[PDB]
C-alpha cells in the first residue's frame, strides 16, 4: 500500500553528476526497504543497476552508485554518458512486498539537437469509401525527443479529433512521434488546405497539403 | 548466457482466467527468485508476484491486489515459472514480464501482453500513404483490436528508413502507421508493399504503395 515517488524527468549533459531519487509515503526510505534501481532501454530492454540500496550489479559501470540521502533512496551518475539517456525505476521491499515507483526520465544531451522530419498524407481512396478520412503526419529523426503538434483547417487551428503520440526512441537514438486529424469523408471534400506544424526547440516545422494536387 | 521467454498473453475477458509461462535456462538459479512485473502506459512497472527457486522448497510473495487471484508456480523439470491469473479485471492489462532476482534484477524476458477486455477482436484496416533527393511513403493500420500488430516493408527487404510509430486507442480500436523512404528515382518505378500481420485475428496484408 505504500506509495513510491519519483521525479518524473530530469536533464544533464555528458560527464555531469546526477542524482535521480524514490520517496515512500510510508515515511524514511531505510536499509531494510532493500532499494532496488531498474533502467529501462527502449523496446523493454531492462537492467538491474542497484539491489539492497547500494549493491551494483556485475557489468554495470562504475559510474552508477546507490544510496540513501535524507530520507530518500537515490541513484546517482557520477559522469553521465549518453548511453545514460533511459528511464529509471525504483522499487522497495515492505517485508512481503515490493513497491516500483513511476520512473524518472533522464534525458542526456550528448547528441547533435536535430530537427524533425515532417511528412502529410492525404486519405487514401480506399478509405475514404467507407466515409472516413485519416490524414497521417509523421515526425522522425529529432532531438530532443521533445515536440508540439498543432493542425490547421483552411488556415483555422483544429481543437477536434487529433491524436498524437508520445515521442519514442527510435533505433538510431532519436525520436519519432506521429499525429493523426480524423475526419468524416464529407468534410475532408468540404474543405482544401491542411496543415501540420511541428514545433521543436522553439522552431516550426510545416507542411501542409491542397486538395488541388 | 541466460535466456528467459514469456508466454501465454493474449485477449482474455474481465472475470477470466488466463494462465503465463515463463521458460528460463543458462545456470543452476536456485540463488534467485523469478518474479512477474507487469507494465502498463499508467502504473509503468508494477509488482505482481515473486517464488524462490530453491530445489529444497518455495517462498512465493504476492502484490495485495492479485493476493486470491493469482498464483505463482514452478516447474524444475521443465524449467518454468508460472502465473495463474485468475478473476481478472481491466487494471490486470499490460505487458507482463518475468525477472531472474537475486539482490538486483539480473535477467530479464521480453514480455507478454495481456489484454482484459470484452472488446471484438477486429482485424485492421491497411490503407497506403502516398505523396499528395528521396520520398517517404507510408503504411495505415487502422482500427485492430487487441494489440500487437507487426509490420515489414517488402517482406523485411527494405529495412532502412523504417519507422513504425505508437498505436493511438480510441474506442476499443487502435491505429498505427510506418513509414518509409526511399529514393525518388526507385519508387514507383519499383514496388514498395508494407506487411502487416495481426496475430489474434491470424491476419496478414499485403499493402502495394502507388502514386495517386
Known amino acids: 500500500q505504500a506509495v513510491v515517488t519519483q521525479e518524473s524527468a530530469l536533464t544533464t549533459s555528458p560527464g555531469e553528476t546526477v542524482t535521480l531519487t524514490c520517496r515512500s509515503s510510508?515515511?524514511?526510505?531505510?536499509?531494510?526497504?532493500?532499494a532496488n534501481w531498474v533502467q529501462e532501454k527502449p523496446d523493454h530492454l531492462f537492467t538491474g543497476l542497484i539491489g539492497?540500496?547500494?549493491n551494483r550489479a556485475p557489468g554495470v559501470p562504475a559510474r552508477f552508485s546507490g544510496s540513501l540521502i535524507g530520507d530518500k533512496a537515490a541513484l546517482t551518475i557520477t559522469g553521465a554518458q549518453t548511453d545514460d539517456e533511459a528511464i529509471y525505476f525504483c522499487?522497495?521491499?515492505?517485508?512481503?512486498?515490493?513497491?516500483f515507483g513511476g520512473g524518472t526520465k533522464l534525458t542526456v544531451l550528448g547528441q547533435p539537437k536535430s530537427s524533425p522530419s515532417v511528412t502529410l498524407f492525404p486519405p487514401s481512396s480506399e478509405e475514404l469509401e467507407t466515409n472516413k478520412a485519416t490524414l497521417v503526419c509523421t515526425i522522425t529523426d529529432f532531438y530532443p525527443g521533445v515536440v508540439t503538434v498543432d493542425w490547421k483547417v483552411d488556415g483555422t487551428p483544429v481543437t477536434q479529433g487529433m491524436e498524437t503520440t508520445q515521442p519514442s526512441k527510435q533505433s538510431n537514438n532519436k525520436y519519432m512521434a506521429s499525429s493523426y486529424l480524423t475526419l468524416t469523408a464529407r468534410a475532408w471534400e468540404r474543405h482544401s488546405s491542411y496543415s501540420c506544424q511541428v514545433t521543436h526547440e522553439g522552431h516550426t516545422v510545416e507542411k501542409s497539403l491542397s486538395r488541388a494536387d | 548466457e541466460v535466456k528467459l521467454e514469456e508466454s501465454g498473453g493474449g485477449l482474455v475477458q474481465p472475470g477470466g482466467s488466463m494462465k503465463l509461462s515463463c521458460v528460463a535456462s543458462?545456470?543452476?538459479?536456485?540463488?534467485?527468485?523469478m518474479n512477474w512485473v507487469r507494465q502498463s502506459p499508467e502504473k509503468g512497472l508494477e509488482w505482481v508476484a515473486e517464488?524462490?527457486?530453491?530445489?529444497?522448497?518455495?517462498?512465493?510473495y504476492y502484490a495485495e491486489s492479485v493476493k486470491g487471484r493469482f498464483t505463482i508456480s514452478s516447474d524444475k523439470s521443465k524449467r518454468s515459472v508460472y502465473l495463474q491469473m485468475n478473476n481478472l479485471r481491466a487494471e490486470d492489462t499490460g505487458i507482463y514480464f518475468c525477472?531472474?532476482?537475486?539482490?538486483?534484477?539480473?535477467?530479464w524476458g521480453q514480455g507478454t501482453l495481456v489484454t482484459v477486455s470484452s472488446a471484438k477482436t477486429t482485424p485492421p484496416s491497411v490503407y497506403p500513404l502516398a505523396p499528395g533527393s528521396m520520398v517517404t511513403l507510408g503504411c495505415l493500420v487502422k482500427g485492430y483490436f487487441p494489440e500487437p500488430v507487426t509490420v515489414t516493408w517488402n517482406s523485411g527487404s527494405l529495412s532502412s528508413g523504417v519507422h513504425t510509430f505508437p498505436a493511438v486507442l480510441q474506442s476499443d480500436l487502435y491505429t498505427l502507421s510506418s513509414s518509409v523512404t526511399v529514393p525518388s528515382s526507385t519508387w514507383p518505378s519499383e514496388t514498395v508493399t508494407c506487411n502487416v500481420a495481426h496475430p489474434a485475428s491470424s491476419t496478414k496484408v499485403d499493402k502495394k504503395i502507388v502514386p495517386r
Open positions: 525477472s531472474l532476482w537475486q539482490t538486483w534484477f539480473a535477467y
Open positions: 543458462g545456470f543452476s538459479f536456485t540463488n534467485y527468485w
Open positions: 517464488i524462490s527457486l530453491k530445489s529444497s522448497n518455495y517462498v512465493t
Open positions: 510510508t515515511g524514511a526510505v531505510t536499509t531494510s526497504n532493500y
Open positions: 539492497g540500496t547500494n
Open positions: 522499487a522497495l521491499w515492505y517485508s512481503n512486498h515490493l513497491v
